[PDB]
Amino acid sequence: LQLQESGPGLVKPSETLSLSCTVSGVSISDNSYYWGWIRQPPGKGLEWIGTISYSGNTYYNPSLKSRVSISGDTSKHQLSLKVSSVTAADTAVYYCARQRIVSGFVEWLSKFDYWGQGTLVTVSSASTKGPSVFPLAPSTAALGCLVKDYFPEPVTVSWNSGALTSGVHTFPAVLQSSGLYSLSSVVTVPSSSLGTQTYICNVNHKPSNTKVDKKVEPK
Amino acid sequence: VDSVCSGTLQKTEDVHLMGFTLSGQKVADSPLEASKRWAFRTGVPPKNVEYTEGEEAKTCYNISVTDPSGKSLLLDPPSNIRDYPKCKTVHHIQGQNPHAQGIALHLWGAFFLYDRVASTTMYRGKVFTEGNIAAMIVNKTVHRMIFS
Numbered sequence A: 001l002q003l004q005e006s007g008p009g010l011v012k013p014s015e016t017l018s019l020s021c022t023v024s025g026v027s028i029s030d031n032s033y034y035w036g037w038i039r040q041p042p043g044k045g046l047e048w049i050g051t052i053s054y055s056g057n058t059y060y061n062p063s064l065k066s067r068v069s070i071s072g073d074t075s076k077h078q079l080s081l082k083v084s085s086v087t088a089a090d091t092a093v094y095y096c097a098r099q100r101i102v103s104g105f106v107e108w109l110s111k112f113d114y115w116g117q118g119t120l121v122t123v124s125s126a127s128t129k130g131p132s133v134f135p136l137a138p139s140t141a142a143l144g145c146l147v148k149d150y151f152p153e154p155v156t157v158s159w160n161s162g163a164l165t166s167g168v169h170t171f172p173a174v175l176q177s178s179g180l181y182s183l184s185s186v187v188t189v190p191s192s193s194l195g196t197q198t199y200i201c202n203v204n205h206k207p208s209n210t211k212v213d214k215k216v217e218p219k
Numbered sequence B: 001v002d003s004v005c006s007g008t009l010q011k012t013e014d015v016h017l018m019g020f021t022l023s024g025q026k027v028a029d030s031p032l033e034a035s036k037r038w039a040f041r042t043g044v045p046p047k048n049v050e051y052t053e054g055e056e057a058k059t060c061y062n063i064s065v066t067d068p069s070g071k072s073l074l075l076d077p078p079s080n081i082r083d084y085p086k087c088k089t090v091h092h093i094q095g096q097n098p099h100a101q102g103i104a105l106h107l108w109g110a111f112f113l114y115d116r117v118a119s120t121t122m123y124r125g126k127v128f129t130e131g132n133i134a135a136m137i138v139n140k141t142v143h144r145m146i147f148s
């Protein structure tokens, strides 16, 4: 029962956006199930994009019908969403979801029972940029990483390959005057462990395929 | 008067066929209710018949229904099928049927009404309302006063 959104985190204006969703544990052409795409602009609400049945048929939202195209690959168990001729207003988080239906005169679109986790796609004429990661030394003890000058979001930050959870607090990125982002992540740790345990952050930036690990040290 | 001779028909133009809706017959017309009166079937040839005037419709439907493969289960509209003239609210519906065959036939024996054309079946993508028709004699003078 899993849905995994996939695709680039950036597209330029007047360019076709392409996203994909890998479905797991259920067949993408199984009867009684429909699959669809939904989008959410930063700080805004949900907008349905379109839905595809268990057969070939697709239905779309008349507000984006001209540009939107959806396809299901029955052998790969995955969806495809195309959005041609993008603009600034297409910047959004795209979601993959499974849609139930009600069988009457027409199979009626219904409740979305399972949702994936979306992909933030930014529309911009700028190109991607990986972050310049710098360590923030500790001083009971607060230490962290500074992920500087990158584009566009998201950035994921793990500590000790996910082993360190307790005390982790990552902050919201700031959009700098330059057009690039800056993001910090810190961990509150026992000061007694500063010289005994290794503390390394794991900065991922999917738009530029960048992964930066950085050991943070005192002094 | 109850006599066979009561009534005069001077031209054929004075025969008027009026379409009255089922909504005007206090029948539930919500899409989910309305669709319970529609059904698919084979072996029946769709028939159409011309009429002259009709009631302003409360609700209408603009429907497309296919089979899973995307092929319409509804017939393509003939040249003479136009959207119903006056609908207050149109219900646009587009979808597919998992296991249905044939054409859409009204259960009550009522007609699918379009613009001056009544039918035993539902045409793909055309605005219609459900109803029945009635025949009567109206001379031009009577006709002119009503419609004006």
Ligand SMILES: *[C@@H]1O[C@H](CO)[C@@H](O[C@@H]2O[C@H](CO)[C@@H](O[C@@H]3O[C@H](CO)[C@@H](O)[C@H](O)[C@@H]3O)[C@H](O)[C@H]2NC(C)=O)[C@H](O)[C@H]1NC(C)=O
Pocket: B062, B063, B064, B083, B092, B094, B124, B125, B126, B127
């Ligand atoms: C009743 O509903 C139908 C849809 O079920 C509406 O028909 C749609 O009419 C428009 C305009 O004629 C069609 O759009 C155009 O289609 C061509 C391809 O045929 C395309 O090249 C154009 O760019 C444009 O999109 C639309 O395809 C057509 N849909 C179907 C299935 O026939 C109709 O307008 C509705 N009636 C009312 C009164 O709203």
Ligand SMILES: *[C@@H]1O[C@H](CO)[C@@H](O[C@@H]2O[C@H](CO)[C@@H](O)[C@H](O)[C@H]2NC(C)=O)[C@H](O)[C@H]1NC(C)=O
Pocket: B025, B027, B108, B109, B110, B131, B132
């Ligand atoms: C004419 O109107 C009557 C009155 O509604 C319709 O009678 C309905 O018929 C259906 C189907 O047999 C029944 O389920 C309903 O209960 C009936 N309604 C009532 C109030 O009794 C009749 O079918 C209509 N026929 C046409 C041609 O329009």
